[PDB]
Amino acid sequence: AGITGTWYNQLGSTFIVTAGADGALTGTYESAVGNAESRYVLTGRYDSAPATDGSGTALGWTVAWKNNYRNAHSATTWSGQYVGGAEARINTQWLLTSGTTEANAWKSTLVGHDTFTKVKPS
Amino acid sequence: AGITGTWYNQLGSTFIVTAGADGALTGTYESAVGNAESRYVLTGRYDSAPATDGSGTALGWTVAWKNNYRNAHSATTWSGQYVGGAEARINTQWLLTSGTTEANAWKSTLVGHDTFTKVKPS
Amino acid sequence: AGITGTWYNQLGSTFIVTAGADGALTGTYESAVGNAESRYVLTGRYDSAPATDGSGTALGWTVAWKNNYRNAHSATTWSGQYVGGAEARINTQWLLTSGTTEANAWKSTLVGHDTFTKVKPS
Amino acid sequence: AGITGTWYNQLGSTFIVTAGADGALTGTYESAVGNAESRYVLTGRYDSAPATDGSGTALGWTVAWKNNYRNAHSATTWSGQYVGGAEARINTQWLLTSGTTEANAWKSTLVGHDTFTKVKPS
């Protein structure tokens, strides 16, 4: 169950999350950490029964940079895997797609990565 | 609203989906198209108010290759953007992460793409 | 076994390439195609000895977007595979990275895909 | 402005590279580091004239995983940027593509990240 919680990224984002018994992910993303109108609904999925081999626990989740206060006309999906214990992290790769005229399709999707930890950076 | 529906991919996958008035995505992924125990719950997010410039409509969604019948200990997040009209498509990039020993972390995430259309391929 | 030549992608860009007998790839890439002021240097590598089970031929290459007529301050790589036959295609995927101040480092790399064909698109 | 040299990543791999005065990149990459049987050819490009606003230096390169001692039937490219200073790092991202039959074409390309530093990791 050790997914549910708060999770901080190197750069200064934060999201708390729940893991539905069945296998859901519900939460909200805070893209600063001292903000309020800069939170966005979070939903995603994670393998609710993982393997017995020290192997990761696959997950993903999406967040749409639009809320009741702002719209970036964009959305990030985080894909990766959660590891547990004392050094416990959420290792992801992420994609970011904006809405584009088809003229600029080709340049619509930023790629990156993010390591989330259960205790703040610096 | 022209997201809700069925969507087919070049290769032979299918997913029907709803767009919550607010901005959610709920659905289920069929990874063949004539299957049944090979469907997986689908949830994700999409910009419920898009821009007025012919620009795409950003979205993403995640699917965990584990259900009541199978487990691939994996998960795909699809990120991209939906375009409408008579030639209407869901253009995405996708990531796939498996659970890995940390020994094999480095090789945990397949990258690809998928163009979804509202009417079957071949 | 005919990587050597001229190739074209979904949007009418072109790169010519000789395929050194070991893995060398060198040649060029032309933003558009009919123009000498928008031409760019290209080097890369490929498997000079692919398996015989009709498996693709892995390859990669690079086009720092700099010449004597423009500097874009950026570089694309292309990773993927050659699949000869009637319809010879170089199915690839690419990462486009610009040079950023440390703060924009995160929005630095586009991701995308590209099919190349020995015949011009539409 | 010191791309030329020896670099190391989070897992103790290494590549040496000369940075041609225009953009050439050539050199090598060593699966591990202390071994001649696991060494691989490397070519690429970089912006030989990056802007002066302390922006990174874009670059890319390729290592078809083939030598006289092993053939992996695959190729990685590395796209990213050089950021000199006290802590000079080449922050990159990479795509690892194997040669596949048309049916496995979809599970063909790993994606991932890599920091390189002029000093060995741990």
Swiss-Prot record, chains A, B, C, D:
Chief localisation class: secreted
Binding site for biotin: Y29, Y40, W78, W94, W106
Motif interval(s): Cell attachment site: 45-47
One GO molecular-function entry: biotin binding
Keyword annotations: Biotin, Secreted, Signal
Keyword Cell wall biogenesis/degradation included in the entry's annotation: no
Annotated GO CC locations: extracellular region
Compartments where found: Secreted
Domain Avidin-like: 1-121
Subunit structure and binding partners: Homotetramer.
Family: Belongs to the avidin/streptavidin family.
Record function comment: The biological function of streptavidin is not known. Forms a strong non-covalent specific complex with biotin (one molecule of biotin per subunit of streptavidin).
Protein name per its UniProtKB record: Streptavidin
Shown chain mapped onto the complete sequence: 39 to 160 of 183
